[PDB]
Amino acid sequence: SMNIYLVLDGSDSIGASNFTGAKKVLVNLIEKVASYGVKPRYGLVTYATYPKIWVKVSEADSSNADWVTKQLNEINYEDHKLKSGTNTKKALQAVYSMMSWPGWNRTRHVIILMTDGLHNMGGDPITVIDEIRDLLYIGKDRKNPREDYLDVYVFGVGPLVNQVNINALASKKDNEQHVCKVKDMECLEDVFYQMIDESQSLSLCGMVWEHRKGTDYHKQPWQAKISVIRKGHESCMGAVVSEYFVLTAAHCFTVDDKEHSIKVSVGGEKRDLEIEVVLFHPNYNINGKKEAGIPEFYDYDVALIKLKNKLKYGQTIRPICLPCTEGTTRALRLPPTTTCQQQKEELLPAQDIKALFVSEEEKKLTRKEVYIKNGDKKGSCERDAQYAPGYDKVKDISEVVTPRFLCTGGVSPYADPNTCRGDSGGPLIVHKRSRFIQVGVISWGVVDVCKRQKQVPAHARDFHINLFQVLPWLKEKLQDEDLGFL
Ligand SMILES: *C(=O)c1ccc(NC(=N)N)cc1
Ligand SMILES: [Mg+2]
Ligand code: NA
Ligand code: NA
Ligand code: NA
Ligand code: NA
Ligand code: NA
Ligand code: NA
């Protein structure tokens, strides 16, 4: 159990612009905490001469991150009156009231105070912290000091901050920093990682460690690089979907590729991983429609690689969320009664869908933003497939562009970058609730525009396998991977 008390100075010396900026910091904090699957109870207080309580921890809705964010969003600087005074002592007493009683020893308390430290009313605020420590039995007995149950963070607001007062109120813990200037984004970023336990979220799909010290492996933890030694060697990308499986494209391999010639690499490890076997989608067949004028048919272009050794999740090796699983429901912060159709309506709505994929560019991994044409622009994106090499004589183009495909690329609504051969097998991702959900697998394209090319044609479209359209296979092959498919 955890309680987070947001206390915002709304006095005269803060000013409108910086008061709003302060809320932004808090809004972003709530969002990031929620993204980690953590559900604390929130206290929301603004103050000047007196405190104004917007949210109390005892309220049932205090643990609803959307509701709290809504409250914070509605708070207007001018709402808080009597700005000529600044009584920080009182602000902390309001927090004291939320803790006092008319399993307590199991609740952790985190106070986040945003002020310039210039109180000109009431006594010394330090006194209240002392009362709070006493109330929570902290620093009273060795072997049970319970220092872990309280954290007092003070974020200095504005250009004219009184460093001494701010330092005085903040917790004092070894190897930790509890004081930050609001504009010092490095410090604020470090605070988060001192507050939330990374361990409690290792089993969560679509998670990324976003710290500034992070590497490409940290930013794309699910990313797997696949090598096939043959003839000309093959290179494909893939995504970790479970401790044993990596999802990629079927065309990356042939029935003539032997297990030992296929190596997988993850997490920035120097070593390669050995595979047990490749599971091609049963309906995949690149020569299945030659008669219809389709030299290579990419329908059902997906495959699951079962590794020999089970992976262990860490900040450089994590699974990406898959459609219609309980993991994606939680990642989206939706009730347990959510259905596959509902996740679909949320992830793949009938419109241009903001999405992204990853592309290696000379050792480094980069994110490419694209738009999935799933609205009244879809038919046009698909028809451009008629301009693909070897597809000039396909009778009905909808015979090559099956319902299994998602379509991206083009100049509308935006100039979409294109996938390169090396990106094939990689995941087409949707970024929601600060989490990453895989909606497709990079398969093929119409125009060869890879270095990425200068300017590309308006018909340079790319196709990807819609995971929603191969769910029965994913659910069947991954039934024992504890992913909780719906
Ligand atoms: C994957 O192997 C892949 C993806 C996209 C393309 N683009 C084009 N053929 N234009 C090729 C290969
Ligand atoms: Mg003031
Ligand atoms: Na709400
Ligand atoms: Na002690
Ligand atoms: Na950890
Ligand atoms: Na480390
Ligand atoms: Na659930
Ligand atoms: Na769909």
Curated annotation (Swiss-Prot):
Phenotypic consequence of residue 463 to W/A: Abolished ability to cleave C3, without affecting cleavage by CFD and interaction with complement C3b
Residues glycosylated per entry: 18, 24, 105
Reactions catalysed: Cleavage of Arg-|-Ser bond in complement component C3 alpha-chain to yield C3a and C3b, and Arg-|-Xaa bond in complement component C5 alpha-chain to yield C5a and C5b
Binding-site positions, Mn(2+): 11, 13, 86
Needed co-factor(s): Mg(2+); Mn(2+)
Disulfide topology: 205-321, 236-252, 324-340, 381-407, 420-450
Cellular localization per UniProt: Cell surface
Active site: 251, 301, 424
Domain VWFA: 3-196
Effect in UniProt of substituting residue 462 to N/E/A/S/Y: Abolished ability to cleave C3, without affecting cleavage by CFD and interaction with complement C3b
Residues binding Mg(2+): 11, 13, 86
Domain Peptidase S1: start-end pairs: 204-479
Subunit-structure text: Catalytic component of the C3 convertase of the alternative complement pathway, also named C3bBb, composed of complement factor B Bb and complement C3b. Catalytic component of the C5 convertase of the alternative complement pathway, also named C3bBb3b, composed of complement factor B Bb and additional molecules of complement C3b. Interacts to CFP; this interaction contributes to the stabilization of the active C3-convertase enzyme complex.
Record function comment: Serine protease component of the complement C3 and C5 convertase complexes of the alternative complement pathway. Following cleavage and activation by factor D (CFD), forms the C3 convertase together with complement C3b. As part of the C3 convertase, cleaves and activates C3 into C3a anaphylatoxin and C3b opsonin, the next components of the complement pathways. When an additional complement C3b molecule binds to the C3 convertase, forms the C5 convertase, which cleaves and activates C5 into C5a anaphylatoxin and C5b component of the membrane attack complex.
Entry protein name: Complement factor B Bb
Full protein segment contained here: 268 to 764 of 764
